[model samples]
Target: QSVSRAAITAAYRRPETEAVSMLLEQARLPQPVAEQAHKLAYQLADKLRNQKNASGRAGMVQGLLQEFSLSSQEGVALMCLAEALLRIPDKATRDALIRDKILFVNAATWGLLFASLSRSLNRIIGKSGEPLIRKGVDMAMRLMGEQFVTGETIAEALANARKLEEKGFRYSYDMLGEAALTAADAQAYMVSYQQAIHAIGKASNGRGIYEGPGISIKLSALHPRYSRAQYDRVMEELYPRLKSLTLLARQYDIGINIDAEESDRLEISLDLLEKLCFEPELAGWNGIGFVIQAYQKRCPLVIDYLIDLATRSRRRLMIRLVKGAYWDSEIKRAQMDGLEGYPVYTRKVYTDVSYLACAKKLLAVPNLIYPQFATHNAHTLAAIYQLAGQNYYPGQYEFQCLHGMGEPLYEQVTGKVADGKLNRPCRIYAPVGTHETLLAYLVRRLLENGANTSFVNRIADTSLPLDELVADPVTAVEKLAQQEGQTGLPHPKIPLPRD
Candidate 1:
C-alpha cells in the first residue's frame, strides 16, 4: 500500500527507529534477489578497490595531501590534516590551527627542526617559526581548494566538463552561491542562473535533456525567508521566480533539479513543485527535476506523492535519489530544539537501506519518474544497477556523482576503467564559482566526505574488509535489531530528553 500524507507527516517528528522498524520490512530484499545484489555489490566494490585509484583527488583525506613535501608517514598525515583545518573560512579556527601547529608539529619532529624551538612550547608561541608555518598552511590550502572546486565560471566549467564529456560522462551545472538575504542577492542569483542556463543550454547544442548539461538550483537561494515563518510570502514571491527560471530551462530543454534544504522546508519545496508541474505553459516538458534526500524517514512517502503528481500533470520527473546532505545540521537542530526525534537516520547504513527502497519505488513507476541514482558507494551503486536490469535504453535511467570527489569511482562504473562492462551513464554534479563563493560549497562537501560514516573516509582505511564495506545494509540493521538496547533508539550520543 502507498504511504499516506498523514502517516508521513506524523513520521516527520517520530523516533528514528520507530519509523525505520516499519520501513525496514518494506526496504528489505527477498532471498534470491538479495543474494544476487549482495554478491554483485561485493565483487564490484572489491574490483574497484583492488584497481587502486590513479587520481589523487579522492574524497576527504586526499584533498589536503594535494601539496605535501614531507616523506614521513606521520608528518605527511599531520600536515595533511592541519592544512584541511586551515582552509576553514572562519579565521578563529585557521588561527587556532596555526597557533597549535608550532607546539604540536615541532614537538613531534624535534630532530627535523631546531631543537631550541621544539624544546619549549610556551616560548615559541607565535614566535619566529610560527610565521613560516602559517605561510606554508596558506599555500597548501590555496592549492587544495583548486582540486575540489571544478571551475571559477560557467564558461570555464563547461570547458572542464568537455574533457569528461568525451569519455561519455554527462554533467549538471550547480551555480555556487546561496542564502540570499537581500533582494539584490536574489536578483543576482537569478541573473547568474539565467546566464548559466544560456551558457549550458548553448553548450548543450540540441543534445536534449538526457544527453545535455543541465542546471541545479536552490529554492531557498531565490528568496531570504524561504522558511515556514513566511509561507504565504514564499508562495507569493518565490513561486513566480522559480517558474520563470524553469521556463528558461524549458526553452533550452535542459533539466532543472532543485537542491537540498533544511528539514522544515521540504513541504514548501514540494508545494511549489506540485504547482510547477501543472503550469499550462510548462506542460509537456519532462526536464524538470528535484533532488530527493534518502536520509529522511519520509522519503518513500514523498516519492509516492511525486509519482502521483507527475501522473496527474501529464509529465514525467527527473528524480535524483541522493543519500542526503545536511546530516550533521539535521542532528544538531533536533537536539537543540529538544524535539522528539531526528528527521534523518542516526546510523549511515539505515540511510542506505532507505535509499535502496526508494530506488525500487522509482524503478517500478518508469512512466512518471526518470530515475537518477546519485552515490559514491559501490554497494549502493551496484545494487541499483542490478535492480535496474540489463537492457539499458538511452533514457531508461542514469547515475550521478560529485565532480572531483566521484570521478574515479564513476569512471570505473562507466566502463572507462579497464574497459569494464558496466556501461551506465553518469552525470557529474559540477559546482562552478570563485573561491569566495566556493567556501560554502567546499565546506559542505568536506563535511559530508569527512564524517566518520562516509564511504569515502572509510574506503582509504584498509582495516575494514571490502566484503564488510559492501555487505548488505539491511542485514546489518537486522543484526543490530537482534542485539539488546538497539532499534527505535536515537543514536547513543543524540538523546531526545523530552521523550
Candidate 2:
C-alpha cells in the first residue's frame, strides 16, 4: 500500500505537504484513488487560495446564492452577464446594457434576472459600483429571510422555535453578529445574550430540554480583545461577562454552548472554557457545552484533554463535534505567518478520519462526555449512528444541523423504515438577526457548503452513489492508520492547571 508518485507530485508546493501526506497516507486509498484525491485536494486548495481575500469571498458568495435561484443553464447565463459587465468599459455602455430588457427577457428566471444582471453590472462600474453591489447583495439576502436566519428579533425567533417544537424539532439559538471590535460593542452583545436568555426562560414550558431552545454564545463577541496577545485583558473582560451569562443560563435552566472560532484562538478559548466549566458559581450545572472542530490536526489530543478533565473532575461535559468553518482562514494565516505547517488537516477525508476517530473516543466515554454531533453529511450521520452502538436510543446523544439546511436528511433518518424508524434527537443551530448582521454568517455558510466537493453540494447532486456516501468509518480510519504504520496520533497541547 505505497503512495503513488503521482499523488506525491500532485501534492507538491501545496502549502502543507507534510500535513497532506499524513492524511493521504492515513486514507490508504488504492493508488488510483489516492491520485484522484491528491488532484482533488490540489483543486480545493487552489479554489481556497483564490478566495483568500474579502472581494473574492464576496463574489463567491454572490455566485453561490445565484446558483440557488438559477438552473444550471441559467447559471451559465448569469456568469456570462458578469463577464459582460466586467467587459463594459464605459458608463453609457453599462447604461445601455442595463436598459436591454429584451436581452435579459429570456435568460432570467423568477423575475430576478434583471436584478442579477444589474448587480453584476455594478461590480465593474468603478468605485460607485461598490455601493450598488452592496445594495444588491443585501436585497438578495433579505429574500432568503427565514431560509438562512431564523428572524430579526428574539420574539420572532421564539415563535419560530415554538413552531419547530410542534414538529419535535429543537433549536440552539445563535444571535447573529460579528466578533466585537470595541468594548462598547462587546457590552452590547453581552446585553443581547442576557436578553435572549431571558426570552428563552420566559418561554420555556417543559419543551426543548434534551433537545434545545437554548443559546450559543460566541466568546470573541464577549470582548473586543480576544487575541492571544491580549490574553490577560481578554480574560479580565471575558470572565465576568461569561460569569454573568452562565449564571443567567443557570437561573433560566437552559443549556449554553461556547462556540468554536479560528485555530489561533483555540488555546485561549479552551483555557477560558476550562475555567468557566469549573467555576464555583456554576458548580452543579451540566448545561454547558463546548464545540471541537475536527479539522484541527490536534483535535484528537484536544478530545483527550477534554475527556481527561471531565473524568478527573467527575463532571459530565458536553462537546458538540464539528468539522470546522475556518479552513481557508487557517491555511492562509499559516502561510502568511510563515509557519512550518498548517494547523488544520488540509484534506477533507483526513478531517473526516479525525472526526470519526474522535467520535469513537467520545462514544466510548459516554459517562464523561455528552456528545452532540453537528453535521449535514449523510455519510457522517450514518458513521455516528453506527458508532453509537446497537442499543442507541433517541435521547442518548443528539445530532444538530443548521436551521436552513439538512431538513431533508433529518426527515430521511426519522422516516419509517423497513426495520424500524431512527428517532435520534436532532437540533437546529438557528441564527437570529436582521439582514445587516447576516453578512458574516452568510459568508461562512457559503464557504462551508458552497464549495464543489463539500458534502452539502455533493448531497444535492443525484449522481453520487449512496454506498460511497455511507461508507464504514472504522474501515476507512483503520486503512489510513495502517498506511501511516500508526495506531494513534499525538495528543494536542493540553490547556489545564499545573498547580
Candidate 3:
C-alpha cells in the first residue's frame, strides 16, 4: 500500500508526530518543499503547543478555523490572532502546541511542520469532510478547557471569585475534580464540594459577609446511576449536603447553579435537581437552575419537563442554554458502541434553530426566570435582543458573555441596556485562574466552537457594522482600530533545518 500525497506531505508539514516518516511517501513532495515543510511543521506545531490560548482573539481564531466565516463584529479577533501568530509563531503557536497538543494537533505526530500542514490541510482547509475537520479541531480545543484559571486552595478560589465580582462580573465555580466512580469516593467528592461551599462562605465574608459568588455543580461527580437504589443512595447523601448549602447560601444571600453534563447523565441530574428543589428549606426558585444544551434534539423536551416541574412547584426556574459541550465525544462514543448517532446537526442550522426554539418556548413560560443567554454569535445575540424586546422584558434577560471574549458585545449590551438605551441586562462569565489548568478549559471552549462551522465562521472575522461600534464603547475602541487601519499581528518565522 503506497502512501497518499496528503498523508506523505502531512508528515513533512508537521514533524512533531513520530509516525510522520513511517507514514510518508518518498516522492509525496518536491524534496525541498517536503524538507522545508517538515521543518516548518515542527515550528508551527511547537508554536501552537507553547502559545498561550489567545484571549479576546480566541473567539476570532476559532471562528476563522472552524466556522470558515466571520461576522464583522467578530472579525477583530481573527485579524488579531493572525497578526499575533505572524509576529510570534514560535512563542505563541509552536510553544502552545507543545504544551497543549489536543489544542493544536495530535500526539500521534512528532514532526512539527508535517503535523501542522497536515492538520491545516485536513482540519482547517476543509480538505477533509467538514465533520472530521471540525471534530478534530474541536477535540484539540476541548482539551484546553477554555483556558480557565484554577486555584489549589479555597482562599485562592475565593480571591479569584472576588476579583471578578469587583469587576461587576459573576463566577460559576467548579472544584477542579471529578465525582468518585465508587460510593466511597463519591462521599469524598461530596466533602470536597461541602468544603468548597464553606470556603466560599468564609472568603466572601465582608462585614461578616458569608459566601462567594455563584458556583457550578456537576451531578456525575456526585452520583452515577448504575442502579436506581444506588442513585437514590448517592443522592440521599449528596442532596442533604446540597440542601444545607442552599440554605446557607440563602441565609448569606448567595446563588448556586447546577451544571449540566453529558447527555447520558442528564436524567440523573434532573432527578437529583427535582429532589433538591422539593425541599421546602431550599431556595429552588432563584438560587437553583439547570443547563439545557441545544445541540441534542432532547433539549426542547427537557425544557418542557423543567417547565412542568417549575409549574407544579410554583417556582421560577433559572436556566443556562448552550450548544452542548460533548458533541465529539458523544458521536465518537456512539460510533464505537455501534449505536446510531445523535440527531444533532453537523452544521449550525440545527443547533441554532434548537436554541431559538428553546428560547421561544422558555420565553412563553413565565415560570422561567431570567435565563443566561450564553453565546458568541452575533446573529444569535441579535436574535436574543429581538426576543427580549418582543417576548420578554429587558430586565428579565441578561446577555452572559464569557470573560476574555470579545468585549464589544458586552459593552453594547451594558451600554445600551444599562443606560436605558437597549433595555436589557448584560453580564460576563468571568473565569479567574492561572495558565496551568487553562489548557483544559481553553481547549473545551475551542472544541465547542470548532464543531460548529458556522460558530467558527461567525467568530473568525475582520469587519463590523459601524453602528455596532457607535452603540458599544468597547466595540467603539475596536472600531477605532479599524478606522486607524488596524489589520492584524504578523506571522512568526518559519524554522530552518538544523545545519
Question: Against the hidden reference, what TM-scores do the models get?
Answer: 0.82, 0.72, 0.57
Better TM-score candidate (1, 3): 1
Across residues 1-499, which tens digit of lDDT does each residue of candidate 3 receive? 1222223223221221122112122112334533443443333222222345333344444555456665543444445444545566467675686469622123122111116887667655555477876676666544555434445555665665545455444555666544345777666666766776676655556312112355566665565443233566657676666676667655545556676666666655666777777887653446675678876656666776777667667677778887777766665554454433333333334355557666667766654555777776655565555554445553365556665563444444444344533434444444433343244456566676565254334333224322321122122223443664541111112121221
| Per-residue lDDT value at 345 in model 1 | 87
How well does candidate 3 score on lDDT at residue 497?
25
Inter-residue clash pairs, candidate 2: 26-480, 301-492
Q: After superposition, how far is residue 349 of candidate 2 from its true place, in Å?
A: 0.7
lDDT of each: 0.79, 0.69, 0.52
lDDT of 1 by residue, 1-499 (tens): 3345555686686667777686787677777777787787777666566564422224333444345544345545575466566668999878877799742553344322117756675456556687867765565555666766678899989887777787888999988888787888888888899899999999998888998999999987798756544778888888999999899998988999899788888888887998899889898999999988899988988888888888889998999999887888888887788866778988888888889889989999888999999998888887888787767675889999987778767867775436865778899898888865665666677787788788888776556777788888888888887884666455667666365
Candidate 2 residue spans exceeding 4 A from truth: 1-128, 144-146, 206-209, 415-420, 471-499
lDDT-sorted candidate list, best first: 1, 2, 3
RMSD of each: 11.0, 13.1, 20.5
The TM-score, computed over Cα atoms with residue i paired to residue i, of candidate 1 is 0.82
Number of the top lDDT candidate: 1
Across 333-374, the per-residue lDDT of candidate 2 in tens digits comes to 766776445677655666777677677778888778889999
